[model samples]
Target: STGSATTTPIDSLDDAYITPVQIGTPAQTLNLDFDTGSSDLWVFSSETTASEVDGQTIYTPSKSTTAKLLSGATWSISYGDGSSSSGDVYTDTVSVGGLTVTGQAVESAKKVSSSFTEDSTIDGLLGLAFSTLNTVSPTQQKTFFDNAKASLDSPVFTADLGYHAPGTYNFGFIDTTAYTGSITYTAVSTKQGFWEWTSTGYAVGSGTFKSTSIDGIADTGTTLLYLPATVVSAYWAQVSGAKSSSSVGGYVFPCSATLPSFTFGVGSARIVIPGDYIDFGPISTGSSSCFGGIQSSAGIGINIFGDVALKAAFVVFNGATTPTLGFASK
Candidate 1:
């Protein structure tokens, strides 16, 4: 925390805002989970001590044939969620779809937890969210985007997909159209990135509250938006058509009402979270409510403004040119 930057410019005002980029490294071929809640890129490495992996894409230096390690650096990160991992620093060329970047810093975890070891699709996560949550060095460290900022053709990236699509999260790209759209841009709160976020307020179903604003963060790692106790209980009480119950660390509401949209003002823009984003499953009266895509997380000064909160918005980061969160339409 000694080197953490205390000041970062607000970027919606600048076209020189730090541009967004994609992962192109082949070393680990890690599973990429685009996150806005946290800003860090981590991959499973061959050096991990955990041996119970079923099928993980491990980052092995000898295997890439072109991988580069930073030699003596290492990181062991512990999140607010109580999850943790440790590894050494490395850098090299990376490519995402059609773009290729170079000298990007990456982690080679020597000890991957059982939670991460469960993935079989790809090896790691490429966080596209914020910077403070970054696992390694942005101070003395350079990210994949940091190294390639000079070569990028554009400075913005966006993600989107339909509910029925399974590979959208697996597949990623930069939508240039998102940069010039009429959508508004909101900046990230001071302490945001991963399990880190601040909520403005929360509303459920058709019931909108007057005191529903709280500072919050948007996350892709989490499935639901966890609100404050007062907000949650109050919201549940108001969704006239909703039947609520405990599900996945949060309350779930089952209803098909045409819900209204709620907004969160980050820095400069207000992100409108549509009412439909709160759908929950196990809709049967007797079934355990399994949220369609929204669920709550245990709270202790921590809240998750997950994917449901980011669906159609354009989010940006600028650890390079600026460290502000930018918002717009996708």
Candidate 2:
């Protein structure tokens, strides 16, 4: 059996790529963040206090015919960026783009940090990472993709995270039209429960590609590109007036500073991020100072090719074999 589903990005919030997902019987449609970094399908639900939930939609499990509370089960998650949520667990019918997964564990939040409680658009998160990363207690939970993979024609999904434009997250099948050029493949290290891969090397500006090995994770949930301190310093050196500032909490530069393009290697592919992409919008709108999207990954052992870097290439997250990444020019 084969099934394919495609989801589009939410135009208002470019930092995240969201898709419409259905939970429970009769289908409660909710906007979900398709995060590849963590494994937890959580939603703002009836368990959450009304004061804690703002303009966001809440998943009312009791109203659904297929919702079943998982006794004694609990879930708690905190993102790298400080957003946290915790709550009870339930089993429900979960579907994405028409592909259904019966008895999928759905974490319903009774509490959410201001970061999540304030967000009005996203109703929940659909983690695409390996099931081993699931956070449910007593029994580990499986991702929707993992539960549906057995019946899929090919155990794979593709992320076309276009720049400030409409993109799609495709499941089961690869759409050749979604990308151009031959798909350059690279083996991934799932030892860390992430789509971790090694970069042959990278280069700043139009310089030759260096062969320095950089172990990094392709994280859809993260908004900026994070590299080792050495790499981050090297890239910042090319920008005029770019400097690490305690006040800015990272490297900052004049809005008009000339930025260099950053390129990463994946086998024969040289995925280049345009120079302008390095300039993460101004630290504060209308301010002359802008924050650099590329920063140091000092504390975190692995670098992260976040949305800033991923948007520069057409990426394929393959579940076949030991898992692989297929890259191509966008």
Candidate 3:
């Protein structure tokens, strides 16, 4: 049977979204961040050392009759944000929405970094990028979608990320009511284990669309949009009083400055990012300057189409043989 559920944002604006998933017998429910940036289905569990964990909930393998340890197997991962988790492995029943899969590999964290321990809201991550990126040693793991896709009517999932509003993640099907207009499809290049694609061109406001091709990854786990330094410079140049601050880590401008909208091309689809959404909240409380939601992809080899850019359109993560991204204005 097909499964679908709402992806509710847990923080301000579009910082992150979590969906409920049951891992183990009798169904131990956990809220996991659906991350497209990494491929690992791990959680804080009984195996985790108490001193390293805080308010976050942990999964207990002993409590599940179906839980079975993968002898000599281990898993560890470090995210782009520097947060890391490592642990032993277990085979157990896992379900998302209403779709269930048996013998799914669940990584139980024995150690976690301060970045994850401080954010108590996130229990673990469900990687959706690609199975090739799975981190389990000896044998790789298949994501929930990958395991359930054969049974689905269509091998497709849609991410309707809303700004401060509720959104839904539809599995095996697309909800036409969630978006408007047509979905412009673009062929994806995924050797990097991500929804990697290229943009034909980009422009500031309604100005000319320069013929500049940009290679980037569509990552839901990330919060901001990261483009090339040249592209980043062009966008911030239009805003007066904008300055790059190492303290703020990106370009910041007077909160009162009137910013122009930005647009980028995907195949034939022209998606526009509203001007108001460009201004992230104040850098610090009572501060006149505000950081930008779009920044430079200097260190990062590929530009990141994070929530800031994804929320502007309804994105379809096509899981067919040749993965393609369908973008529609929401």
Candidate 4:
């Protein structure tokens, strides 16, 4: 009825978090990125182009007795980062932690982009967003969380992301001990197929909180926090030697400069991100300039509270008749 899984960062920069998933009858395990920003349970498999397969694990549907091809069914998805994958579909028993879903759609990747091929840490992505975003043609398939929701003790899942350590993803029930203060809840807008919500306001370091309704999505798949240009510029202004460099692709500052903490409001609750987390590592090896964890979302169209912000609190994706998101400081 419930299950839990440990997710670890693939790199020291916390570029992406990966969790092990079991697919097929005999259970071929592969490390997958649990992306709350998209809807598709795709994986690298035997069907993938051999040249595209690097050191990552692959799912072999033919070896699994329960694997059944979804004839004529196909899927293709392109992420905001530009990476993409596509292939025919198959239905099989898919398991995450201890939660199992029979006849779960397992998209096998026959072709992948250069970005995916270069990254050896992630085999594919396990989408936790709304199923309405599913790319399967003719027949849209539900996400793993959607199918397992009915059997869970509670139709909910929680994300506890870490800075440079292993975090947790729990389904069915909330772990009260995982967070500090009482959770602050807000209604979610699934109209965009994302875990979209609005923040009441924000504050930079010890500055006075600004009252503004900032709309954004809680995306685990993304690595950095993106906000409106005005908000982003405000935070960077506090740091000495910080500049928005077109050549560098974002706001960067001297690595030695003392960085200010960032805080965002969830209803009346305030979650603060540590200054150390904001210093997102150097621009290059031995370089003094560092990339900021928080960047401007001017051209992105939508603001995103990615790992940089989510790591500051415990997040709950409540799948009730009226979906809601819960945030609590840890």
Candidate 5:
């Protein structure tokens, strides 16, 4: 069996993509972030502190007849951005799009950081990464993808992220008409519990392609594209008034300045991100300085090909025994 779901950008700057998910017996539909970087199907819930709750929807396991407590099972997750959440676990009937799982682990949040409380657009997160990264203790839990893959037509899922527009997430089957050209497949390493792969190289605008092996992860949860300092600096140098600012953070330039497109290689295929995508948006309201979507991953340790890069192509996360990733121009 196969399933499909529509995901939309939370805001104009594409801060995060939110998709609708059904949890519990009668189905409590909540908007959640389909994150590929982490593994934990966590949600804001009735167990959450009232002071921490904002405009987000909460899942009440007590209201679902199919919900069953996991006893002493608990979970805690921390993101790269320093935000964190923790709570008890429950097994309940869960569904995404048209796919259903009878006993899916649903992490009910009891405590959440301030950043999560401020984001009213998203009610929780649905992790799509390898289950090895799951944060549950005592008895580790599997991701929704892991639990559903066995009954699916194929052990695979595809991400078609859009810029400002709505995109799609398809499970079990790839949509042939969703992309153009041929798909370029590459080996994936789950050693780090991420969909990590090495990119051939990159180019700025009309510049020549540089043959360098850049290892990174495909993370739909992150907002921008992060690369080596050298490559990031090289791209910023092409802009007239661009400068790295400690105050504004990362690279910033005049909003009126023209930016160049970015290109990256996936095997022999090349995906080009339009110049407009890198402009991001102004540092603040009415500010002339605009932040760049491509930044240095120097201190961060690992590079990340986030939404900025993924939005340029149709990506497939193959869950075969020897997992692989496929990219195609759209």
Candidate 6:
């Protein structure tokens, strides 16, 4: 939150580039909300002529000749943040680093909002998580990564986002940078749904949960952690005087207080979450020690180990692996 960085959206294969992201670049690197929920590559396109969108990154098709169109099929996408986009579909040559895939899916929103459509540095999102919540109705097979994963020599991706939860995204193979030691993934329930799992344990603020665990889903699409109130209370108990006053519907507390430290239990391993990320400071001045990054989504039902929980370890989704999305490390 204290540093400034450069990020840009990719509309063509050539635009996608990644080096050791140390400082800012000519084009700011972006973290596409990896969603198994959606299928296509949806980024704010420069081709849009309509000028109402605010944070939206405009893609200049003229900049890349490999860009394609979605044959006039009207496109629309909605995120959990209440942000939505409607645009024209386009087929483009998409690539990331050395990996290249032709005819990849993309969207050019004709209309976008200020929340996402405005001058937000985030260009577009490249979904690498999973393909269960695709909103592209009438299309039963809408998997963006599924079609491209096989093309990479490693087909592996490691999201190097330390500032955000689920901070890192490791695709086909697990990237070794995120681990303190070995990483192991437990078997997930194949009970028909998005790639979800229940961790047997996780360390909170340096404490380990050997038996006390969570039935949480690791979702890159979600921005925050939605844990059960019981777990939330248990975590907040770590703080000296943290209280759930419902200032913003969930367990809102003081930021200055000591926050609960924890991680997810993935088999014999534990994934750590940064403590500073604990307080969603927007609500208060870190006074509510409601495990800053962890919150209460009572009515939402089910605990979600959002991106906040994923950044600490390496995640691998091997199509060759039985249950798909298996966590691993170097």
Tens digits of per-residue lDDT, candidate 2, 1-330, equal: 344444555543366777888899889988888888999999999889789899888899999999999999999998888899989999999887767889999999999999887778778899988989999998888998898888777898878886767677777888888777888999899998999998888999988788888889998877789999988898999888899988878999899887899999998678999887777767887999988989988876779999888888888889987899988887
Q: Against the unseen true structure, what C-alpha lDDT does each candidate score? A: 0.50, 0.85, 0.86, 0.94, 0.94, 0.53
Candidate 5 residues lying further than 4 Å off, grouped into runs, are none
Clashing pairs counted in every model: 29, 0, 0, 0, 0, 51
TM-score of decoy 3: 0.96
Q: Lowest summed lDDT over 10 consecutive residues: which window, candidate 3?
A: 6-15
For model 6, residues 154-209, the per-residue Cα lDDT tens digits are 54444443452213343445545555566465556535345567777655566657
**Model 6 residue-pair collision total:** 51
lDDT of 1 by residue, 200-310 (tens): 444454445344446566565554566556655555554554444544445554444444455555544456666665554444556644344444344557656655665
User: What TM-score goes with each of the models?
Assistant: 0.70, 0.95, 0.96, 0.98, 0.99, 0.76
- The CA lDDT at 13 in model 4 is 84
- Cα deviation of 229, candidate 5, in Å: 0.3
In angstroms, the error of model 1 at 282 is 4.4
RMSD score of candidate 3 (Å): 1.5
How close to the true structure is residue 286 of candidate 5, measured as C-alpha lDDT?
Answer: 91
Give the clash total for candidate 4.
Answer: 0
What is the C-alpha lDDT profile of model 4 across 66-105, one tens digit per residue? 9999999999999987789999999999888899999999
Whole-model alpha-carbon lDDT for candidate 1: 0.50
lDDT tens per residue, model 3, 23-72 = 99989988888888888999988888898778878899999999999888
